[PDB]
Subunit: 152 residues, 6 copies
């Protein structure tokens, strides 16, 4: 496949998503890094987003609840290059009816090569990374070349 | 769960999606129903959309290729009430890498209660149906009440 | 692959299936179009089928419960050309233990090209189509040619 | 879940299923045990069944090909108590488009408590078991009591 | 794929795994066949293993709970040729969060060609088989040749 | 779910895994960061591990190939606290026969809270983070308390 590059802005567009049993963990993590997170643009699925802003007073762009289409909205944003970082604390110990949406979101985040964290340890490692506040170049698939081949 | 209603406009916003082995099937279907489809608003995933407009000259709002996020873009539109009909000829005899996206899209179309066709027979029944050109009231989940309960 | 045709009879063999949280939805729908549905042949999975006939008095050929094999029984009938329409209101907001059976059934209905409705909106559009009570030709895979190639 | 019993006849109704890459293995196994298999009733999916009878001359009740609905036909027979043994050599090293059918068939064989072999070693152990040729009593779910509870 | 052979010892290394709703089923099965199981080496996932030894007094090498990694530990042992028989009573009527682990374990047991039972009927047939207490060869993939080809 | 802590050593035990189509990407990544990686303990699935050591001369503890049980071996090591970092470049654009193993491994890495990278962008962020070269305490589920509750 053909690759090209895209630049993640210094001010990142961060998506925050958490399954019910992981919400408390994300809440703590957010409050813990609030000073830093306040410098970036926050997005989240319906319930997560509302709980975060209601507790931290931070401004969060909340989409629909995950089961109602929120995960796909986030996924769409990622593919459109509008989300630079994805913090998705999905529940590995409970079955979710919208599991396909969950897997699809993680698959897209992988395809588009953006930093992704699915647990607190990875989230801390990412946010503490030196370049998390700088503009950073990532290799992404060259869609134009890709689509051109499908139509040749 | 509480329900409410939404009105599908007379002029429908139709999403056209087809997996590679089903593209010819959808092409023919579109061509044979062109006179009727020309009166509605067409959307489609990357490859499908381009092949349709290139062959029929019809105007199609093409999103990204399915594997690159197109299916989630369509799903997001559905959950936002911007797509009224989904024609998704997915391939039942081949494994697709983005199967989760596929299943997630069909799951959302089910949740939001919009007419969905996954084969030619169902597509024909829907397009030939009386209210396909009339405004129709469909029952959809009441998101406001739903979110309110989660945030209680 | 090789395709051929089959004719859906004017009188259709309809399969009615609904997951627990969608049963009320299907019941209402059925009652709504009872006069029309009585003109066709009804089949259903165990619980769904029994609740329908017990409430409407309609004659329903009830198979086993979905989790106990009912979905595969319906799927088998579809592949054998004995089911012409599938009304399957599956639950998109709850995880079902027999999910593979659910996906398998929907996969077969897609392969054999029969009208399928997974929500009320699609069900209404289908039943209101002019040719619902007419015979209609559908393209189905040519199994004979298919198997011949495999051997 | 109340349980009841069912008796597997001395002459068993055996289903033989194999994915393409495992067909040679099943063939060999069938040929090596032909003398014994000949005193039971054989059923199989389309391709497998035809290959077996064309090679061994044995009489096999062949259903549809697995991908065309053959697995669900076998599954239905199992739930109806018409299949006593399932020898299903599915391919663990290749993705199959009809994976849900495959998983659904194995799920049913588990629910109805019939002997199932998914590899040669298990097949050999089962066929060599003393009670393979006698009437065996197995515990199966009591459907009547089960359905009655659902309609309470 | 070129195969090779491996010999299952007379004293089998048996893995016992059961989902919560099937635990009673496995317990009874184990108690009924205790005299025979006593002759082999028993392994199990966390909860299953502890319930068995606590009820039968038998010695069970218990690994982690299935959801916490126990299924993959068993799977790793199988692939390493350290498990000869797998008795896995998984629940076909309930969705399990660690379903991928369950499917991955069953997939590996299939690849490495070891006797596997997912219900009581199959378990009984296997344990009652003559070579269950005998050393016996099984055909297994020839990994060395396989890896050599990948490189 | 009672939580406890575990310390990730300064010298990390890193698992390197890549699907065939992503192998060149991981190779490049490993080569450009070789000086740093040479300081930690490397583990990998069969093919990946062998390709890495054959190309970099680095010492890699290679397990079985992924499809043959390699992923479960890595998963088992993670649950036993023997792996501290997982770099798993799985293919989001191809269906893998051993998908359940892939999902199971990722599910375990999430449960045990260890840093996980599934694309180059995340891998770079993690390796450039301060605590990659230092010892650091992370929270993990308290298994003792967990098991104790299951047997009560």
């Amino acid at each position: 496949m053909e690759l090209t590059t895209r630049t993640l802005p210094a001010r990142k567009h961060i998506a925050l998503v958490a399954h019910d049993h992981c919400k408390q963990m994300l809440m703590s993590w957010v409050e813990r890094h609030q000073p830093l997170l306040e410098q970036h643009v926050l997005y989240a699925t319906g319930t997560t987003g509302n709980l975060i802003s209601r507790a931290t007073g931070m401004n969060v762009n909340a989409m629909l609840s995950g089961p109602m289409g929120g995960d796909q909205q986030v996924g769409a944003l990622i593919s459109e290059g509008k989300i630079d970082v994805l913090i998705f604390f999905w529940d590995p110990l409970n079955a979710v009816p919208h599991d396909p949406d969950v897997k699809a979101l993680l698959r897209l985040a992988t395809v588009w090569n953006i930093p992704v964290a699915t647990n607190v340890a990875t989230a801390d490692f990412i946010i503490q990374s030196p370049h998390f506040n700088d503009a950073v170049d990532i290799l992404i698939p060259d869609y134009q070349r890709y689509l051109a081949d499908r139509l040749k």
